[PDB]
CSV table of all heavy atoms in Angstrom, one decimal:
chain,number,residue,atom,x,y,z
A,1,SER,N,6.4,-3.2,-1.2
A,1,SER,CA,7.3,-2.3,-1.9
A,1,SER,C,8.4,-1.8,-1.0
A,1,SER,O,9.4,-1.2,-1.5
A,1,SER,CB,6.6,-1.1,-2.6
A,1,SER,OG,5.9,-0.4,-1.6
A,2,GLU,N,8.3,-2.0,0.3
A,2,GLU,CA,9.3,-1.4,1.3
A,2,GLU,C,10.6,-2.2,1.1
A,2,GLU,O,11.7,-1.5,1.1
A,2,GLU,CB,8.8,-1.6,2.7
A,2,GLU,CG,7.8,-0.6,3.1
A,2,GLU,CD,8.2,0.8,2.9
A,2,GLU,OE1,8.9,1.4,3.8
A,2,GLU,OE2,7.8,1.4,1.9
A,4,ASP,N,11.7,-3.6,-1.6
A,4,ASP,CA,12.3,-3.5,-3.0
A,4,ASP,C,12.6,-2.1,-3.3
A,4,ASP,O,11.7,-1.3,-3.5
A,4,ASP,CB,11.2,-4.1,-4.0
A,4,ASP,CG,11.2,-5.6,-4.1
A,4,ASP,OD1,12.3,-6.2,-3.8
A,4,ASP,OD2,10.2,-6.1,-4.5
A,5,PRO,N,13.9,-1.8,-3.4
A,5,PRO,CA,14.3,-0.5,-4.0
A,5,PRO,C,13.8,-0.3,-5.4
A,5,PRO,O,13.4,0.8,-5.8
A,5,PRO,CB,15.8,-0.5,-4.0
A,5,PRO,CG,16.2,-1.9,-3.8
A,5,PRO,CD,15.1,-2.6,-3.0
A,6,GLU,N,13.7,-1.4,-6.2
A,6,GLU,CA,13.1,-1.5,-7.5
A,6,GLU,C,12.2,-2.8,-7.4
A,6,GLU,O,12.6,-3.8,-6.8
A,6,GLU,CB,14.0,-1.6,-8.6
A,6,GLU,CG,15.0,-2.8,-8.6
A,6,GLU,CD,16.2,-2.6,-7.8
A,6,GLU,OE1,16.3,-1.6,-7.1
A,6,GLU,OE2,17.2,-3.4,-7.9
A,7,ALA,N,11.0,-2.7,-8.0
A,7,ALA,CA,10.0,-3.8,-7.9
A,7,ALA,C,10.6,-5.1,-8.4
A,7,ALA,O,10.7,-6.1,-7.6
A,7,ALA,CB,8.8,-3.4,-8.7
A,8,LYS,N,10.9,-5.2,-9.7
A,8,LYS,CA,11.5,-6.4,-10.2
A,8,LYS,C,10.6,-7.7,-10.1
A,8,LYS,O,11.0,-8.8,-10.5
A,8,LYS,CB,12.9,-6.7,-9.6
A,8,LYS,CG,14.0,-5.9,-10.3
A,8,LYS,CD,15.3,-6.6,-10.1
A,8,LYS,CE,16.4,-5.9,-10.8
A,8,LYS,NZ,16.1,-5.6,-12.3
A,57,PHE,N,4.5,-11.0,-6.4
A,57,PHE,CA,3.6,-10.2,-5.5
A,57,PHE,C,2.2,-10.7,-5.6
A,57,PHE,O,1.5,-10.8,-4.5
A,57,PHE,CB,3.7,-8.7,-5.8
A,57,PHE,CG,2.8,-8.2,-6.9
A,57,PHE,CD1,1.7,-7.5,-6.5
A,57,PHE,CD2,3.1,-8.5,-8.2
A,57,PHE,CE1,0.8,-7.0,-7.5
A,57,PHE,CE2,2.2,-8.0,-9.2
A,57,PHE,CZ,1.1,-7.3,-8.8
A,58,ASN,N,1.7,-11.0,-6.8
A,58,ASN,CA,0.3,-11.3,-6.9
A,58,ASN,C,0.0,-12.7,-6.4
A,58,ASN,O,-1.2,-13.1,-6.2
A,58,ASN,CB,-0.1,-11.2,-8.4
A,58,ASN,CG,-1.6,-10.7,-8.6
A,58,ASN,OD1,-2.3,-10.5,-7.6
A,58,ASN,ND2,-2.0,-10.6,-9.8
A,61,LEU,N,-0.6,-11.9,-2.0
A,61,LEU,CA,-1.8,-11.3,-1.5
A,61,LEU,C,-3.1,-12.1,-1.9
A,61,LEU,O,-4.1,-12.0,-1.2
A,61,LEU,CB,-1.9,-9.8,-2.0
A,61,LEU,CG,-1.9,-9.6,-3.5
A,61,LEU,CD1,-3.3,-9.6,-4.1
A,61,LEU,CD2,-1.3,-8.2,-3.8
A,65,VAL,N,-6.3,-12.8,0.4
A,65,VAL,CA,-7.7,-12.5,0.1
A,65,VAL,C,-8.6,-13.7,0.1
A,65,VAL,O,-9.7,-13.7,0.6
A,65,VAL,CB,-7.8,-11.8,-1.3
A,65,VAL,CG1,-9.2,-11.6,-1.8
A,65,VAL,CG2,-7.1,-10.4,-1.2
A,69,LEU,N,-12.1,-14.3,3.1
A,69,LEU,CA,-13.5,-14.6,2.8
A,69,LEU,C,-13.5,-16.0,2.0
A,69,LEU,O,-12.6,-16.3,1.2
A,69,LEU,CB,-14.1,-13.5,1.9
A,69,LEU,CG,-14.7,-12.3,2.6
A,69,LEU,CD1,-13.5,-11.3,2.9
A,69,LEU,CD2,-15.7,-11.6,1.8
A,70,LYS,N,-14.6,-16.7,2.3
A,70,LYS,CA,-14.9,-18.0,1.7
A,70,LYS,C,-13.6,-18.9,1.6
A,70,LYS,O,-13.2,-19.3,0.5
A,70,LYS,CB,-15.6,-17.9,0.4
A,70,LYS,CG,-14.8,-17.1,-0.7
A,70,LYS,CD,-15.7,-17.0,-2.0
A,70,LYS,CE,-15.0,-16.2,-3.1
A,70,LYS,NZ,-13.8,-16.9,-3.6
A,72,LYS,N,-11.5,-22.1,1.6
A,72,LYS,CA,-11.7,-23.5,1.1
A,72,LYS,C,-10.6,-24.4,1.4
A,72,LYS,O,-9.4,-23.9,1.4
A,72,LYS,CB,-12.1,-23.5,-0.4
A,72,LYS,CG,-13.3,-22.6,-0.7
A,72,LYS,CD,-13.6,-22.7,-2.2
A,72,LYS,CE,-14.9,-22.0,-2.6
A,72,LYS,NZ,-15.0,-21.9,-4.1
A,83,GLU,N,-14.7,-20.3,-10.5
A,83,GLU,CA,-15.6,-19.3,-10.1
A,83,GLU,C,-15.2,-17.9,-10.7
A,83,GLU,O,-16.0,-17.1,-11.2
A,83,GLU,CB,-15.6,-19.2,-8.6
A,83,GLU,CG,-16.4,-20.3,-7.9
A,83,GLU,CD,-17.9,-20.1,-8.1
A,83,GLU,OE1,-18.4,-18.9,-8.3
A,83,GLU,OE2,-18.7,-21.1,-7.9
A,87,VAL,N,-17.5,-15.6,-13.3
A,87,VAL,CA,-18.1,-14.4,-12.8
A,87,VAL,C,-17.2,-13.2,-12.9
A,87,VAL,O,-17.6,-12.2,-13.5
A,87,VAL,CB,-18.5,-14.6,-11.3
A,87,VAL,CG1,-18.8,-13.3,-10.6
A,87,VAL,CG2,-19.7,-15.5,-11.2
A,88,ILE,N,-16.0,-13.3,-12.4
A,88,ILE,CA,-15.0,-12.2,-12.5
A,88,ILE,C,-14.7,-12.0,-14.0
A,88,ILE,O,-14.9,-12.8,-14.9
A,88,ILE,CB,-13.8,-12.6,-11.7
A,88,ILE,CG1,-14.2,-12.9,-10.3
A,88,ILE,CG2,-12.7,-11.5,-11.7
A,88,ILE,CD1,-14.8,-11.7,-9.5
A,89,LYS,N,-14.2,-10.8,-14.3
A,89,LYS,CA,-13.9,-10.4,-15.6
A,89,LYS,C,-12.7,-11.2,-16.2
A,89,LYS,O,-12.2,-12.1,-15.6
A,89,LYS,CB,-13.5,-8.9,-15.6
A,89,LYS,CG,-14.3,-8.0,-14.7
A,89,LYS,CD,-13.6,-6.8,-14.3
A,89,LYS,CE,-14.3,-6.0,-13.2
A,89,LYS,NZ,-13.5,-5.0,-12.5
A,95,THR,N,-3.7,-15.6,-14.5
A,95,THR,CA,-4.0,-16.5,-13.4
A,95,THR,C,-3.4,-17.9,-13.6
A,95,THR,O,-3.8,-18.8,-12.8
A,95,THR,CB,-5.5,-16.5,-13.1
A,95,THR,OG1,-6.2,-16.7,-14.4
A,95,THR,CG2,-5.9,-15.2,-12.5
B,11,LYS,N,-24.2,-11.0,-10.3
B,11,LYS,CA,-23.0,-11.9,-10.4
B,11,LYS,C,-22.8,-12.6,-9.1
B,11,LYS,O,-21.7,-13.2,-8.9
B,11,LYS,CB,-21.8,-11.1,-10.8
B,11,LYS,CG,-21.9,-10.5,-12.2
B,11,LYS,CD,-22.3,-9.1,-12.2
B,11,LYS,CE,-22.6,-8.5,-13.6
B,11,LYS,NZ,-23.1,-7.2,-13.5
B,13,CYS,N,-23.4,-15.5,-7.7
B,13,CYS,CA,-23.7,-16.9,-7.6
B,13,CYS,C,-23.0,-17.5,-6.4
B,13,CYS,O,-23.5,-18.4,-5.7
B,13,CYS,CB,-23.3,-17.6,-8.9
B,13,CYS,SG,-21.5,-17.7,-9.1
B,14,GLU,N,-21.8,-17.1,-6.1
B,14,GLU,CA,-21.0,-17.6,-5.0
B,14,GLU,C,-20.3,-16.5,-4.2
B,14,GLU,O,-20.0,-16.8,-3.0
B,14,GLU,CB,-19.9,-18.6,-5.5
B,14,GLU,CG,-19.4,-19.5,-4.4
B,14,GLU,CD,-18.0,-19.0,-3.9
B,14,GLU,OE1,-17.4,-18.1,-4.5
B,14,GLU,OE2,-17.6,-19.5,-2.8
B,15,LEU,N,-20.1,-15.3,-4.7
B,15,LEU,CA,-19.4,-14.2,-4.0
B,15,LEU,C,-20.4,-13.2,-3.6
B,15,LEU,O,-21.5,-13.0,-4.2
B,15,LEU,CB,-18.3,-13.6,-4.9
B,15,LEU,CG,-18.7,-13.0,-6.2
B,15,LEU,CD1,-19.1,-11.5,-6.1
B,15,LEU,CD2,-17.5,-13.1,-7.2
B,16,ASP,N,-20.1,-12.5,-2.5
B,16,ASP,CA,-20.9,-11.4,-2.0
B,16,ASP,C,-20.4,-10.0,-2.5
B,16,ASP,O,-19.5,-9.9,-3.3
B,16,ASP,CB,-21.0,-11.5,-0.4
B,16,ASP,CG,-19.6,-11.7,0.2
B,16,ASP,OD1,-18.7,-12.0,-0.6
B,16,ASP,OD2,-19.4,-11.6,1.4
B,18,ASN,N,-18.8,-7.8,-0.7
B,18,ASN,CA,-17.5,-7.5,-0.2
B,18,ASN,C,-16.4,-8.1,-1.2
B,18,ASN,O,-15.4,-7.5,-1.4
B,18,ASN,CB,-17.3,-8.1,1.2
B,18,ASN,CG,-16.1,-7.5,1.9
B,18,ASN,OD1,-15.5,-6.5,1.4
B,18,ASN,ND2,-15.8,-8.0,3.0
B,19,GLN,N,-16.7,-9.3,-1.7
B,19,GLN,CA,-15.8,-10.0,-2.6
B,19,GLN,C,-15.8,-9.3,-4.0
B,19,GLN,O,-14.8,-9.5,-4.7
B,19,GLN,CB,-16.1,-11.5,-2.7
B,19,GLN,CG,-15.0,-12.3,-3.3
B,19,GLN,CD,-13.8,-12.5,-2.3
B,19,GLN,OE1,-12.8,-11.8,-2.4
B,19,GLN,NE2,-14.0,-13.5,-1.4
B,20,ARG,N,-16.8,-8.6,-4.3
B,20,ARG,CA,-16.9,-8.0,-5.7
B,20,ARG,C,-15.8,-7.0,-5.9
B,20,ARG,O,-15.3,-6.9,-7.0
B,20,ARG,CB,-18.3,-7.4,-5.9
B,20,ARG,CG,-18.5,-6.9,-7.3
B,20,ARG,CD,-18.4,-8.0,-8.3
B,20,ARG,NE,-17.1,-7.9,-9.0
B,20,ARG,CZ,-16.7,-8.8,-9.9
B,20,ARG,NH1,-17.5,-9.8,-10.3
B,20,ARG,NH2,-15.5,-8.7,-10.4
B,23,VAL,N,-11.7,-8.4,-5.3
B,23,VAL,CA,-11.1,-9.3,-6.3
B,23,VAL,C,-10.5,-8.5,-7.5
B,23,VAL,O,-9.4,-8.8,-8.0
B,23,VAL,CB,-12.1,-10.3,-6.7
B,23,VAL,CG1,-11.6,-11.0,-8.0
B,23,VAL,CG2,-12.3,-11.4,-5.6
B,24,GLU,N,-11.3,-7.5,-8.0
B,24,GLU,CA,-10.9,-6.8,-9.2
B,24,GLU,C,-9.7,-6.0,-9.0
B,24,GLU,O,-8.8,-5.9,-9.9
B,24,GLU,CB,-12.1,-5.9,-9.6
B,24,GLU,CG,-12.6,-4.9,-8.6
B,24,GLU,CD,-13.2,-3.7,-9.2
B,24,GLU,OE1,-13.3,-3.6,-10.4
B,24,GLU,OE2,-13.7,-2.8,-8.4
B,26,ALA,N,-7.2,-6.8,-6.9
B,26,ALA,CA,-6.1,-7.7,-6.9
B,26,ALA,C,-5.7,-8.2,-8.3
B,26,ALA,O,-4.5,-8.3,-8.5
B,26,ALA,CB,-6.5,-8.9,-6.0
B,27,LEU,N,-6.6,-8.4,-9.1
B,27,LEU,CA,-6.3,-8.9,-10.5
B,27,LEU,C,-5.6,-7.9,-11.3
B,27,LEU,O,-4.8,-8.3,-12.2
B,27,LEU,CB,-7.6,-9.4,-11.2
B,27,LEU,CG,-7.4,-10.4,-12.3
B,27,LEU,CD1,-6.6,-11.6,-11.9
B,27,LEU,CD2,-8.8,-10.8,-12.9
B,29,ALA,N,-3.0,-5.0,-10.8
B,29,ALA,CA,-2.1,-4.2,-9.9
B,29,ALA,C,-0.7,-4.5,-10.4
B,29,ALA,O,-0.4,-5.4,-11.1
B,29,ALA,CB,-2.3,-4.6,-8.4
B,31,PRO,N,3.4,-3.5,-8.5
B,31,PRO,CA,4.1,-2.8,-7.5
B,31,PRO,C,4.9,-1.6,-8.1
B,31,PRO,O,5.4,-1.7,-9.2
B,31,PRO,CB,5.0,-3.9,-6.9
B,31,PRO,CG,4.4,-5.2,-7.3
B,31,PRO,CD,3.8,-4.9,-8.6
B,32,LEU,N,5.0,-0.6,-7.3
B,32,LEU,CA,5.8,0.6,-7.7
B,32,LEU,C,7.2,0.5,-7.1
B,32,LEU,O,7.6,-0.6,-6.6
B,32,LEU,CB,5.1,1.9,-7.2
B,32,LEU,CG,4.8,2.1,-5.7
B,32,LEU,CD1,6.0,2.7,-5.0
B,32,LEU,CD2,3.5,3.0,-5.6
B,33,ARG,N,8.0,1.5,-7.3
B,33,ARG,CA,9.4,1.5,-6.9
B,33,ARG,C,9.6,2.5,-5.8
B,33,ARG,O,9.2,3.6,-5.8
B,33,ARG,CB,10.3,1.9,-8.1
B,33,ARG,CG,10.1,1.0,-9.3
B,33,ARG,CD,11.2,1.2,-10.3
B,33,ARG,NE,10.8,0.6,-11.6
B,33,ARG,CZ,10.9,-0.7,-11.9
B,33,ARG,NH1,11.3,-1.6,-10.9
B,33,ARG,NH2,10.5,-1.2,-13.1
B,34,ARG,N,10.3,2.0,-4.7
B,34,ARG,CA,10.5,2.9,-3.6
B,34,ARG,C,11.7,3.9,-3.8
B,34,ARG,O,11.8,4.9,-3.1
B,34,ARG,CB,10.9,2.0,-2.4
B,34,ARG,CG,11.1,2.7,-1.0
B,34,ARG,CD,9.9,3.6,-0.7
B,34,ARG,NE,8.7,2.9,-0.5
B,34,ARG,CZ,7.5,3.5,-0.4
B,34,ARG,NH1,7.4,4.8,-0.5
B,34,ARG,NH2,6.4,2.8,-0.2
B,35,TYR,N,12.5,3.7,-4.8
B,35,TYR,CA,13.6,4.6,-5.2
B,35,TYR,C,14.6,4.7,-4.1
B,35,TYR,O,15.0,5.9,-3.7
B,35,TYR,CB,13.0,5.9,-5.7
B,35,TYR,CG,12.5,5.9,-7.1
B,35,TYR,CD1,11.2,6.3,-7.3
B,35,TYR,CD2,13.3,5.7,-8.1
B,35,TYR,CE1,10.7,6.3,-8.6
B,35,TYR,CE2,12.9,5.7,-9.4
B,35,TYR,CZ,11.5,6.0,-9.7
B,35,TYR,OH,11.1,6.0,-11.0
B,36,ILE,N,15.0,3.6,-3.4
B,36,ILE,CA,16.0,3.7,-2.4
B,36,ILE,C,17.4,4.0,-3.1
B,36,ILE,O,17.7,3.3,-4.1
B,36,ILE,CB,16.1,2.4,-1.7
B,36,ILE,CG1,14.7,2.1,-1.0
B,36,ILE,CG2,17.2,2.4,-0.6
B,36,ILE,CD1,14.6,0.7,-0.5
Side-chain angles (χ1 to χ4, degrees):
Chain A
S1 59
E2 285 304 278
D4 278 336
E6 63 272 11
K8 273 205 180 309
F57 85 105
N58 215 358
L61 59 86
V65 170
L69 280 78
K70 61 182 177 67
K72 299 183 176 170
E83 284 286 340
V87 164
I88 303 299
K89 319 153 190 168
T95 45
Chain B
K11 295 98 189 175
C13 72
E14 200 261 346
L15 59 86
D16 44 349
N18 197 10
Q19 198 72 264
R20 184 62 261 175
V23 164
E24 56 157 359
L27 201 55
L32 59 85
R33 308 192 190 282
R34 183 54 63 192
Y35 281 120
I36 302 168

